[PDB]
């Protein structure tokens, strides 16, 4: 089965809206050209798929803040991934573009949920490597965030990474200057970028020189507690960055809204 187990619809951005005809579940149908893949892995059963598939299988167990792979298919020249599609949905990059700099209460709820999702990944041995507002979807009714696009991801390891294919402006200074990083510490850097994006309405750094200068100028009013968390995540030295635990125990991170509260207060 393939083309008629899913009624397929319009382009989203090569990703199509689909409905699984066996039960009308909304889905997203992602096509990936074999030529444009550089990383491959093997599933539990041995067979050789794109890394993206391997990583999504590993995290698609149970419920979480990550968009789940429901199925996939090989074609002669492509793979096709069937993903959860929540509805109504908007990605965080568009949400921030329209709303501007988010209120701290809202930024705290989003950022916490992204931290839970990234922790979930790491627990499954998966490093995303492209955390950013464009790779985050907001389910507007439930107030739940979901991570997408594992296409630059890797298996989590504790040794150094010398390859990177994510977004440069969310990449850390050790990558810019030395083409090396460690997973968690890089992930925390990009989480600092993302947090600034939320409270200020745009990312802090556009150019390599700004990234390695680590001078964080705040363009909107932001509380001292939040500025501190952000500066901590954006420490130049990787070992000076906070662990995931220290981020979630930070004073600015306390008394988070539940997802449904977040929807009711800020999204409905």
């Amino acid at each position: 089965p393939l083309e008629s187990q899913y009624q397929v619809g319009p382009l989203l951005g090569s990703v199509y809206s689909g409905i699984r005809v066996s039960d009308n579940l909304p889905v997203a149908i992602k096509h990936v050209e074999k030529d444009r893949i550089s990383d491959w892995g093997e599933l539990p059963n041995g067979t050789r798929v794109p890394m993206e598939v391997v990583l999504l299988k590993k995290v698609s167990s149970g419920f979480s803040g990550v968009i789940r792979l429901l199925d996939w298919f090989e074609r002669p020249d492509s793979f096709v991934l069937i993903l959860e599609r929540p509805e109504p949905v908007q990605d965080l990059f568009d949400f921030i573009t329209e709303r501007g700099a988010l209120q701290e209460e809202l930024a705290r709820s989003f950022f916490w949920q992204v931290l839970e999702a990234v922790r979930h990944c790491h627990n499954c041995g998966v490093l995303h490597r492209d955390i950013k507002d464009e790779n985050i979807l907001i389910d507007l009714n439930r107030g739940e965030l979901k991570l997408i696009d594992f296409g630059s991801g890797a298996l989590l390891k504790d040794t150094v990474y010398t390859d990177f294919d994510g977004t440069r402006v969310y990449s850390p200074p050790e990558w810019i200057r030395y083409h090396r990083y460690h997973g968690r510490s890089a992930a925390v850097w990009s989480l600092g970028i993302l947090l600034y994006d939320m409270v200020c309405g745009d990312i802090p750094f556009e150019h390599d020189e700004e990234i390695i200068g680590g001078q964080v100028f705040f363009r909107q009013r932001v509380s001292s507690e939040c500025q501190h968390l952000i500066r901590w995540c954006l420490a130049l030295r990787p070992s000076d960055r906070p662990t995931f635990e220290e981020i979630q125990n930070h004073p600015w991170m306390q008394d988070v809204l539940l997802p449904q509260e977040t929807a009711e207060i800020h999204l409905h």
Binding site: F93, T97, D130, K132, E134, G151, S152, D165, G166, T167, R168, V169, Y170, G201, D202
Partner: peptide
């Protein structure tokens, strides 16, 4: 000007 950033 706020913009998206490709991989």
């Amino acid at each position: 000007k706020r913009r998206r950033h490709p991989s």
